Design a protein around this nucleic acid. Structure first.
Ligand code: SF4
Ligand SMILES: [Mg+2]
Ligand SMILES: [Mg+2]
Ligand SMILES: [Mg+2]
Ligand SMILES: [Mg+2]
Ligand SMILES: [Mg+2]
Ligand SMILES: [Mg+2]
Ligand SMILES: [Mg+2]
Ligand SMILES: [Mg+2]
Ligand SMILES: [Mg+2]
Ligand SMILES: [Mg+2]
Ligand SMILES: [Mg+2]
Ligand SMILES: [Mg+2]
Ligand SMILES: [Mg+2]
Ligand SMILES: [Mg+2]
Ligand SMILES: [Mg+2]
Ligand SMILES: [Mg+2]
Lengths: 99, 99, 83, 208
RNA sequence: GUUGGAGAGUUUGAUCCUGGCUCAGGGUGAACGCUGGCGGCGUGCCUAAGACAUGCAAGUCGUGCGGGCCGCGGGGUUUUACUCCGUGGUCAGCGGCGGACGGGUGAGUAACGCGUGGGUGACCUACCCGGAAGAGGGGGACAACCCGGGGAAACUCGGGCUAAUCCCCCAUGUGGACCCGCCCCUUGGGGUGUGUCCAAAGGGCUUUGCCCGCUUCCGGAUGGGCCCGCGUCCCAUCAGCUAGUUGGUGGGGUAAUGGCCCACCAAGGCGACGACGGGUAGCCGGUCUGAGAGGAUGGCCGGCCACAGGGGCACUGAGACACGGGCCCCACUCCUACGGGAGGCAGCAGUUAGGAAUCUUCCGCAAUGGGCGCAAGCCUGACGGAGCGACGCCGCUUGGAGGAAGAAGCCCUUCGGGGUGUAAACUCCUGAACCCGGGACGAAACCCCCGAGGAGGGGACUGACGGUACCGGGGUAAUAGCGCCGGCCAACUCCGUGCCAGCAGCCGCGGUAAUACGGAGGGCGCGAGCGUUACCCGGAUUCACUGGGCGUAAAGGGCGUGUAGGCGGCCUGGGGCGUCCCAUGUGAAAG
């Protein structure tokens, strides 16, 4: 009586739930480095982008955070840590920051 | 063709923004007379040196605000306040239709 | 993709197709890009099949794969002859 | 489809000998050469002034009845003449004689267009070797009008084919008796076919 | 071989003028009245975006993966049972691609919605094509299935396994992305340096090869998002509207600019060139009229928009805020075993209600087209076809010739005759319908062979329309109706009627001897149609741009002053805004 191709909903929901995960994982994660970059440290902070960045890209392998939307976060996030760090610190350990 | 337009200002009263008033002159599609039609544009003056009386040029530019999609281009002449009157007086003729 | 399909016209009981290119998701008789020849299967004329064999190789190069009743026509006109 | 009614009334009503019957037409028993006045009771009674709209209707009816045709085709095959370049009044007289049911009459295969149309419609006349059973066939130049060989032996055609033998065919046709084929040469002018029609009136009619 | 313009009746004793009303014309997605034959092509719910029974319209892939199930061949512990290998088909499931195209509607929208021209240094595009470089290892998940439990179905829960083009990590890095500087145009474009980050799938066959896939990157084509100048209905009896409003700083957000969202600042924004509000309405190419200018219309063909009972909502994907996907509130409806469930024809038919009115619950993928697997092939109410309806256009038939100084009946009269009238009957001539025999075009490719899965060539299966069209032969004269007859307006007499019955679009006619009413005879116009009504344009130079007026006909403000606006004497020079000329692009197709 109905379209057996309603299966796409199943595929949709597990895709959705398998999207909210990693996308939100970028959030709280990159919400951790900023405070750390604000509250001072860099070793245990510039180490975080290192993985944060790696995840954004990994989201871009699939249909989650796709496109150059990473290049919206991967650009505006490592845009602040710099300015964050000269506020007591100066760009410290050899992480993702060029010079 | 990014539509260059030339027109007299009307205000210098907002930050980085002015009010170019340009004039269009054309016939009447029904009557052979050649009539005037005018329109007000809002422009982008980041130097804040385009001021009142300045007869300037504007261009179809990238969106800057809601009603601000044109940039200022260059200057033609500054000593033109007698036209601003014709705006200052018209809108003050608008005064006398009330209670 | 983009197709080299046909567009049927003419009176009923007189199919007159236009060897044409639309986008794939387009109606049979819509805003095509390029007509490249007429086609009648009922054989009313001696010149009953024109084909831009040079302009075809445009869209054939830029990526336009056609249908059975479209590939054979380019052969009947000789687009694949080049040797 | 056609008139199918009383014919001699037409000829009396328009005060002109409409040659529609056939052999009786030129005979001394042509109703006009018997009763030359409009029919129906008030014939001999004094006919008052023709209203300025009248005389332009009647000539229009003359031609209409001369060729045996309705008034949609008459109009539609008149619209074309008005649009088609040239003098409006005689292009119209061109696309008329081009009609198949006329030509056969002009070819003397029949003495009457009304007679001719039947022969056309019945599968007897042939154009370029094809069984054309259409009266309203715009005969184009260089066409082969002939009696179908499958029916070129009836007891009607020969009598009326013989009846022509050496008749002065229209100065625009080519008749071959026994060969039974008649080729459409050029195309007519009013000066080539003189009729009692001020065709300009039909214009002035169809402009009111 | 395209070209364009007609007026008339009506006020008065009578005339001229202004002036209005009415008519003849063309068109219809029309209906209705009376008739009614055939075929070709089209077209067919404007009304209630109201409610829908039922059937059908969105699937495809074993050359991706695992499994239940049925046939066929092989089997195993020597063994029942059973279990297994291979091949075909079917059921479903994980997975990939398609359900964002197709098809319907016109509620909404007075808006960058549409049309036109541009911009994008502000972006997107899977399947297509072209070029460069690659696929080395390891881990795992959830359904299908098994067990159990519940419900009438809907369905759902709890436990336990597992494969893969599924998930995840590491390895390399053609190359892409990012922060910070540097080389050139300039809005985020183009390189480069150091640092950081990012890849991968297998399946098959004729395996030392080929087809189909995968991953990163650049480019083309197509298809989109957005911004802008310009034109787009009425009401001035709507004269003020504005607190995200208007600009900015900064952050967010998306593929991208944005006052799209939020925080702080300064008061700014719009309007008589008509802001705000009200009413109507989808827009265009086109269509109808008009000589033109103009006026009205956008059904069906095609382009764009918006909607899928009303409304909001986000997910999935490259793409929707998605008609036949999901969620939630409202209203409606349907189902039952009463605990509870479900549904959305403005998709093809078809029903109901509303109406003056609107199609068969048909056939087939043969064709074109679309989606899937390479491929055979599946699906395709898109479509191609037929079915209904004189709704429109066109074509065609109800016979042709001969035939009476003129049968019959009917009509008129002055009784002598005159009309229907070649009209009828009659002779001949062909033969719509009918009958038989043949029988299509639309249909040559996907497939197979040779050939390299190339080029090229050879071979073969396939039709709903339809035994239709058509063709060959035979063979009967065989439906005609409607309006009008006072002027406009073509077409006349008799009878009855006697301000009654009635006709009538304007004038008007009928008040006894009617060419207007009712009937006949006859005549005029059309003809398988004819008339009525409604609407659009015209006629209406009667909103006057072409193309009008204001002494007495409707019309000069009661006068003055004056802002905005409109308009402006003579001469010279400049810029060339309007203006004019040439080229080029666009102006899609259909019209
Ligand atoms: S010419 Fe013929 S049609 Fe004319 S009236 Fe005489 S017979 Fe009758
Ligand atoms: Mg304006
Ligand atoms: Mg001229
Ligand atoms: Mg831009
Ligand atoms: Mg592009
Ligand atoms: Mg401002
Ligand atoms: Mg509306
Ligand atoms: Mg539906
Ligand atoms: Mg939820
Ligand atoms: Mg098919
Ligand atoms: Mg018909
Ligand atoms: Mg008339
Ligand atoms: Mg009386
Ligand atoms: Mg004027
Ligand atoms: Mg007076
Ligand atoms: Mg006044
Ligand atoms: Mg052009």
């Amino acid at each position: 009586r109905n379209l057996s191709a309603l299966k796409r909903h199943r595929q949709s929901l597990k895709r959705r739930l398998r999207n909210k995960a990693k996308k939100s994982a970028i959030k709280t994660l990159s919400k951790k480095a900023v405070q750390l970059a604000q509250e001072g440290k860099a070793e245990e902070a510039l180490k975080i982008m290192r993985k944060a960045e790696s995840l954004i890209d990994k989201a871009a392998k699939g249909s989650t955070l796709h496109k150059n939307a990473a290049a919206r976060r991967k650009s505006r996030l490592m845009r602040k840590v710099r300015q964050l760090l000269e506020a007591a610190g100066a760009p410290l350990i050899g992480g993702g920051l060029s010079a | 063709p990014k539509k260059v337009l030339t027109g007299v200002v009307v205000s210098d009263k907002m930050q980085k923004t002015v009010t170019v008033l340009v004039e269009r002159q054309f016939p009447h599609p029904l009557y052979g007379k050649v009539i005037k039609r005018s329109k007000k544009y809002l422009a982008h003056d980041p130097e804040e040196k385009y001021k009142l009386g300045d007869v300037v040029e504007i261009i179809e530019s990238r969106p800057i605000s809601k009603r601000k999609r044109f940039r200022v281009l260059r200057l033609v002449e500054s000593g033109r306040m007698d036209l601003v009157e014709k705006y200052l007086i018209r809108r003050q003729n608008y005064q006398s239709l009330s209670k | 993709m983009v197709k080299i399909r046909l567009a049927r016209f003419g009176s009923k009981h007189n199919p007159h197709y236009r060897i044409v290119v639309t986008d794939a998701r387009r109606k049979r008789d819509g805003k095509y890009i390029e007509k490249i020849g007429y086609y009648d299967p009922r054989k009313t004329t001696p010149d009953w099949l024109k084909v831009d064999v040079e302009r075809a190789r445009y869209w054939l190069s830029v990526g336009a794969q056609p249908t059975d009743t479209a590939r054979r026509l380019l052969r009947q006109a000789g687009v694949f002859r080049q040797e | 489809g056609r008139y199918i009614g009383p014919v001699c009334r037409l000829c009396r009503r328009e005060g002109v000998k409409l040659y529609l019957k056939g052999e009786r037409c030129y005979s001394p028993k042509c109703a006009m050469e018997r009763r030359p006045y409009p029919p129906g009771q008030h014939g001999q009674k004094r006919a008052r002034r023709p209203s300025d709209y009248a005389v332009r209707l009647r000539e229009k009816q003359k031609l209409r009845r001369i060729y045996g045709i309705s008034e949609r085709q008459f109009r539609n095959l008149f619209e074309e003449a008005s649009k088609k370049k040239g003098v409006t009044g005689s292009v119209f007289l061109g696309l008329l004689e081009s009609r198949l049911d006329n030509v056969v009459y002009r070819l003397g295969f029949a003495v009457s267009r009304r007679q001719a149309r039947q022969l056309v419609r019945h599968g007897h006349i042939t154009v370029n070797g094809r069984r054309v059973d259409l009266p309203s066939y715009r005969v184009r130049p260089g066409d082969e009008i002939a009696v179908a060989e499958k029916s070129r032996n009836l007891e009607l055609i020969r009598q009326n084919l013989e009846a022509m033998k050496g008749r002065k065919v229209g100065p625009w046709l080519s008749l071959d008796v026994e060969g039974m084929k008649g080729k459409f040469l050029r195309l007519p002018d009013r000066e080539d076919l003189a009729l009692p029609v001020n065709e300009q009136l039909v214009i002035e009619f169809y402009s009111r």
